[PDB]
């Protein structure tokens, strides 16, 4: 945990939406961004999955918005920790949300 534990936040802060929350204290975060193609002068929508540690101080369900901070390698695929959660309402339609 970044508050009661022994890790430090340093580097880049990012925002994303919750994609899955099945592991004990970990989640998968979805990030959305745009890619430009010069030949056609148009864009493509791309997304990536980023895993993070979720401390027991936060309650999170799918579709929520989270702020993640960079930490040292905590496992094979984890280098981020959750530091803020904003709830999202019920049955809200999935939307493309760059952040």
């Amino acid at each position: 945990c970044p508050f009661t534990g022994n890790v430090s936040i340093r580097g880049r802060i990012l925002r994303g939406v919750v994609h899955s929350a099945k592991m004990q204290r970990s989640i998968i975060v979805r990030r959305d961004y745009l890619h430009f193609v010069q030949k056609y002068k148009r864009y493509e929508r791309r997304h990536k999955h980023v895993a993070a540690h979720l401390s027991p101080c936060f309650r999170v369900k799918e579709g929520d918005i989270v702020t993640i901070g960079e930490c040292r390698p905590l496992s094979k695929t984890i280098r981020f920790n959750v530091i803020k959660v904003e709830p999202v309402s019920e049955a809200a339609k999935k939307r493309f949300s760059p952040f």
Partner: protein, 143 residues
């Protein structure tokens, strides 16, 4: 319209062109790989082989002639081809079981002229250009 034109549609356009540019005969012949594996010269300017039979081939219907050619076997492949020596009276300079250098015609791999099913040309025999032997610049007294 018929073509997609939205601001976020680059992926579809790329995929459409990727799929559709395989319909050109030239693009396929170049970027597919079958021709390279089927061409006895494997993308080389010319090859070196051994002549094994001297033969004459008739021309097509509107013409009337017997063209002089030889059968060759490529050293680096061991396969068989037919190569044609054009210059007048140059068959007598080519002898059976002789080392030759064989190149292509003007067109990449199609038949040229009224010669049926022939795609190669003889240019050097025994190390001396045929064009030079025909003009009497040099002589083949080594053979």
């Amino acid at each position: 319209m018929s073509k997609t034109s939205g601001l976020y549609t680059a992926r579809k356009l790329r995929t459409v062109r990727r799929v559709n540019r395989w319909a050109d005969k030239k693009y396929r012949k170049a970027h597919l790989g079958t021709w390279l594996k089927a061409n006895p010269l494997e993308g080389a300017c010319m090859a070196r082989g051994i002549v094994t039979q001297k033969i004459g081939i008739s021309a097509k219907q509107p013409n009337s002639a017997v063209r002089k050619a030889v059968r060759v076997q490529l050293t680096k492949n061991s396969k068989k081809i037919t190569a044609f020596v054009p210059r007048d009276g140059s068959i007598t300079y080519i002898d059976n079981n002789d080392e030759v250098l064989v190149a292509g015609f003007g067109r990449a791999g199609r038949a040229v002229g009224d010669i049926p099913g022939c795609r190669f040309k003889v240019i050097k025999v025994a190390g001396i250009g045929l064009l030079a032997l025909f003009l009497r610049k040099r002589e083949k007294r080594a053979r």
